[PDB]
Amino acid sequence: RRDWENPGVTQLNRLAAHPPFASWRNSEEARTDRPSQQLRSLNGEWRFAWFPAPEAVPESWLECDLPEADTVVVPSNWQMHGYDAPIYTNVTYPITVNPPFVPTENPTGCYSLTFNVDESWLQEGQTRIIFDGVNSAFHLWCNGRWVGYGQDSRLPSEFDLSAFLRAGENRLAVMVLRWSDGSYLEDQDMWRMSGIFRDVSLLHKPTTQISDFHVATRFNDDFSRAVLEAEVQMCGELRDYLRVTVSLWQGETQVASGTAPFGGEIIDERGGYADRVTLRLNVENPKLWSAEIPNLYRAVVELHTADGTLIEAEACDVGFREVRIENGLLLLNGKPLLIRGVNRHEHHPLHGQVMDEQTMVQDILLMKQNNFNAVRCSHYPNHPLWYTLCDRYGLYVVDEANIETHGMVPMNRLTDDPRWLPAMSERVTRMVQRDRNHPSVIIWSLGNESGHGANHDALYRWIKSVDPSRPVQYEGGGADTTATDIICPMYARVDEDQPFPAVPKWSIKKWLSLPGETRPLILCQYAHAMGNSLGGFAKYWQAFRQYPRLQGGFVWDWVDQSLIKYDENGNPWSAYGGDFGDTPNDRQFCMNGLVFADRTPHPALTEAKHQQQFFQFRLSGQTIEVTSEYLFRHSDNELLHWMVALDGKPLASGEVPLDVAPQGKQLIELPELPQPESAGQLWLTVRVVQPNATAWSEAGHISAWQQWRLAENLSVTLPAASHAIPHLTTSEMDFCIELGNKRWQFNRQSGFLSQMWIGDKKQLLTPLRDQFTRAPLDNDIGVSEATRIDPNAWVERWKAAGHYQAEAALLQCTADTLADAVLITTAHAWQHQGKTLFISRKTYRIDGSGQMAITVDVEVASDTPHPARIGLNCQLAQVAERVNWLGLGPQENYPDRLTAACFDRWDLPLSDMYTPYVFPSENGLRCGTRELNYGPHQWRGDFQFNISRYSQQQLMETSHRHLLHAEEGTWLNIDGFHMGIGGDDSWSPSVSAEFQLSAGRYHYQLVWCQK
Amino acid sequence: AALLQCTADTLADAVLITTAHAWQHQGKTLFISRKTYRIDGSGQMAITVDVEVASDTPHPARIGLNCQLAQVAERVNWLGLGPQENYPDRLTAACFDRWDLPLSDMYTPYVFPSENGLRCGTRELNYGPHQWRGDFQFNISRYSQQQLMETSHRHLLHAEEGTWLNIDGFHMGIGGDDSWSPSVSAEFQLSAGRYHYQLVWCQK
Ligand SMILES: OC[C@H]1O[C@@H](OC[C@H]2O[C@@H](O)[C@H](O)[C@@H](O)[C@@H]2O)[C@H](O)[C@@H](O)[C@H]1O
Ligand SMILES: [Mg+2]
Ligand SMILES: [Mg+2]
Ligand SMILES: [Mg+2]
Ligand SMILES: [Mg+2]
Ligand SMILES: [Mg+2]
Ligand code: NA
Ligand code: NA
Ligand code: NA
Ligand code: NA
Ligand code: NA
């Protein structure tokens, strides 16, 4: 029948979907969510064999274990066990586009399990098996007999095994196809794997049973009264003595309870549902649920007889909240949300797409700790536990159907085709049936990147009918079609329009006000955090706070989808597209997260944390005004710590309790500060600290900070006049300068400082030279590739202009003696194919104090692409342990991504000065630096720098961090100016004009001395 | 202007004068200006200026130099934005080219006198025997900034001896979104803290 090549068959013999059940036979267990003996896990060791096509599977396997099989753990993705390769492709399908057919060589995983069933489960009642996730389609047999078939890799498939099992040992056989017609709907930008990758369980339910239950909470105008409504459905034989009791608990207190026999109200001319009942419970002053305070109640649904015998109980966590869009705003509990969201795929560097509770918790804790309050399930329903964690920890969730057909041409080819409406329908309806009681889900999404087709409009309306409690969004076809209640673009820019035909991406500020538009706008994906990125993040946050209808967005995305491989020595390394022989592949495009696959943060996470703070600050004099952006809570676990320091030297500090209502302000007056001793800049840093631990943070957690410059007393004192005067020696080849123990050598033929000595020790491995390029970031490269150059990408413009190849031509090199110093004057031209790209003119002035002051004035041809940087570089002979600086930090920061950094005195081990992006590039910059110390050297000025053991050349030539090797000595790059890194997207130039080095003429000055 | 330093060095083919000054008020240092003047065998005077402005002082209206020249010439010739008066936040209509007007056209006769007649983006300016080159903004007229500021009606201004030249490395925007609250946008305020500019002054 080849059911896997027919979108008209998405299942055979599958049971209806429904919310999470456990069939407790003890009501107190159901109240406290304790494990149920009626819900057994079949996870653990199973038998598995791999075949290249279903045609290759032997018939013997249905009744007997294959001796050749292996024992493996389930859940798992079989690529993670090495049976075949995972594939990383973004848009292009991994199989030929020829719906609904799939390749004849279709990797088939044959899983089986011998397991016991107790007679008690078989004497009465129903025993079903539940596969929470099987990718992408499968047939199931039990004790040799065929049971059924299922598709949709991201929702549970359940089958009644009652008539197939026997007491004692039984054997399941599951034939899992890698590719199926369901694959046409599963084109998300992620690794393509397969297998039984979510839990497998067995559930016993009584013959007369709760088959579904829906919980709703409705409120009066001020949220001081609610009615909880629970509709309960049964299967099995109706009897007058049956009853349903629904009770509501807040902790150990019972708040309300109601009982009724079955029999619903009249629905139409034929009557009502005799098999359902709706219980209505009044709740006065309910504790409301939000991500700020995830207050939860427990609803316990009991099916029992009138005389009091329990038949079974089901239950769920209930969060009293209302979600609605009114007057163009998305309101939660009547207040307008500001979504500090992130998209999160289910990805583990060792386990592939298998999720575990520890990693889920780790993700939620890091998210909350970093000021996120929302998560989008990009782009499919998640493992069930995720919703329970978001309900209890408090995160708003966008639950999204497993429908993505990005690779079709045009993108809506399937979604506008009615023959695909049935398969799409089940992806949406079965998700709502499973997840509609979770308070954390506040919005449903119809899928991702599948154009806009009439199937979407039919499904949008279905959801609006069945569950009016949550808005429906969908971005396909232009982000603002009739299938979305929220304008939800991906990567629309703040101020810049991108007027693509048919599906323009307007500036978000402009989009809100197009003629006739009134909806809220929340970007489904924004700020592409691939590599060294997040440049321009702050511009989004300023716009979200200024415009009521810009209600935030979901960053793209949480975690890099890198996978671990092992080298010949057994050591692990992070791999990306193409590293498994997979081809075609989209290389490093699978790594776009704020955190590395192991959950270590990239530096961009701190920028997101700062911009997403819940407290805003203003300073006027000695007065700090603190404004709360919380909607519901008062600042009852917060104090403000303030510190004033002079050039990094601490002068005074204090603490003040914060007591700010939601949306309110607090005025704090700082105490007078005695005028500082010395000259310099006074800086004020304030932090909000949480003194007590929470379920998601440790005592002492810092949730928000900001700095301001206070008074500055410019230095007007003349220095202690030199005890000596340096000596110049002129030679045909060099100009040398001597001062005590120091010596500087300037090469007359190159025009550069080629060597320095302290005592008898040489200080340089490569001369000090101008540098106008950077090892390109993922954002500089975009989609450009050797075989398919994108001439618009910054890297290609620089390359084509000759920036990477240009040679310094010496124009002048002279030496003069002054009363107290020696002055070397140079001028160089960088040219390419006859064109002068840049001119650098400098003076180096070495005085009796031993200081070398370097003044640099650069001219950049107006018609050459703006350069990546304007600075100097050198390879120092020394390798020292620490890096100490007065400037922005402590983490890597770039011009367009430096708001989270603070100006202070920082000191880190050298290796913290290198950011190990998987795909190596320029990294580790620190901006706004006035002093840098390393080994015996000190440089002073107003510059940006990086320092590490890897040269720019090595970073640009290396594609994987594991291949980098420390070079001799230490490469120092000191920039007067550095271009932004961009990040609105990683496929088109995204560095805003204000961060491009277009001024034409640049000046900077450095002083290099000893310390 | 308190003098912090004033030195002279003789070089290979030039004389180098270095100066440093601090402007203070009531004990507060507002601005520091560090300069070098390099006069060579060609007769050109290269001036380099590096100014520091206290972060806590209100951003200044301009960062430049001024002097009253003895010369009074009929024309003003420049390579830069024009021909009309233009300021940083009001120069889109001006075009870069070589302009040449009579001196009086370099003054705008606002009824209530004020700073006026600036031209920005100028790379070369000629007046009588003098030529200044660099990348600056300037105005030039027979009226001192002092006179303009003290005189409330244009008809009461009187031409001073000579010609007042204001050559700026940087000049604050003029604003205008309204005339009753500060309206110069941040990007046109001189808040960078450190400013660099260079000019060459020569004859003919
Ligand atoms: O992380 C990759 C990112 O790619 C986005 O698509 C990028 C760009 O690729 C082209 O092949 C498409 O035709 C073009 O329309 C698209 O914008 C995708 O939107 C994101 O979801 C993400 O996969
Ligand atoms: Mg099928
Ligand atoms: Mg028990
Ligand atoms: Mg048996
Ligand atoms: Mg896609
Ligand atoms: Mg490729
Ligand atoms: Na807003
Ligand atoms: Na991607
Ligand atoms: Na508090
Ligand atoms: Na690289
Ligand atoms: Na006046």
Short mmCIF file of C-alpha atoms in Angstrom, two decimals, chain A residues 681 709-718 815-820 823 845 855 857 859 930 942 999 1001 1003 1005, chain B residues 3-5 9-13 16 22 24 28-32 34 50 52-56 123 135 194 196 198:
data_model
loop_
_atom_site.label_atom_id
_atom_site.label_comp_id
_atom_site.label_asym_id
_atom_site.label_seq_id
_atom_site.Cartn_x
_atom_site.Cartn_y
_atom_site.Cartn_z
CA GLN A 681 36.01 60.64 34.87
CA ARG A 709 29.18 59.39 33.44
CA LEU A 710 29.20 61.77 36.43
CA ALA A 711 31.60 64.75 36.80
CA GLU A 712 34.86 64.73 34.76
CA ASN A 713 37.93 66.78 35.85
CA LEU A 714 40.20 67.02 32.90
CA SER A 715 43.88 66.71 33.66
CA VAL A 716 45.67 70.08 33.34
CA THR A 717 48.88 69.25 34.99
CA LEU A 718 52.07 69.26 33.19
CA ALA A 815 63.50 61.42 11.72
CA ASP A 816 63.82 64.66 13.67
CA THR A 817 65.21 65.49 17.08
CA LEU A 818 63.30 67.75 19.41
CA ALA A 819 64.43 69.32 22.63
CA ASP A 820 63.31 66.35 24.61
CA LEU A 823 60.15 62.25 16.22
CA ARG A 845 57.27 60.73 19.33
CA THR A 855 49.51 59.74 16.13
CA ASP A 857 45.69 60.07 10.42
CA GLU A 859 42.45 58.71 4.47
CA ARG A 930 41.49 54.05 27.53
CA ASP A 942 40.65 55.76 23.24
CA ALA A 999 33.94 59.31 7.28
CA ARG A 1001 39.41 60.75 7.21
CA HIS A 1003 42.37 60.20 13.47
CA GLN A 1005 46.35 58.39 18.97
CA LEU B 3 48.46 78.58 29.14
CA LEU B 4 49.75 75.21 29.96
CA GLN B 5 52.57 74.90 27.49
CA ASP B 9 61.61 73.33 18.15
CA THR B 10 63.68 73.81 15.10
CA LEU B 11 63.54 71.04 12.63
CA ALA B 12 65.24 69.89 9.46
CA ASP B 13 63.19 72.06 7.19
CA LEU B 16 57.50 73.63 15.21
CA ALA B 22 42.93 75.05 29.40
CA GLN B 24 38.30 77.26 33.01
CA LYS B 28 36.30 74.03 36.38
CA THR B 29 38.28 73.06 33.34
CA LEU B 30 35.80 73.16 30.42
CA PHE B 31 38.08 72.59 27.44
CA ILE B 32 41.68 71.76 26.69
CA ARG B 34 46.54 71.09 22.19
CA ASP B 50 43.22 68.32 19.40
CA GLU B 52 39.19 67.77 24.85
CA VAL B 53 35.74 68.87 26.17
CA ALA B 54 34.65 68.00 29.72
CA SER B 55 31.86 65.39 29.55
CA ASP B 56 29.90 67.27 32.15
CA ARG B 123 38.25 72.06 1.69
CA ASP B 135 38.01 70.04 5.99
CA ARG B 194 37.70 64.64 21.85
CA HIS B 196 40.64 66.69 15.96
CA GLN B 198 43.88 70.36 10.84
#
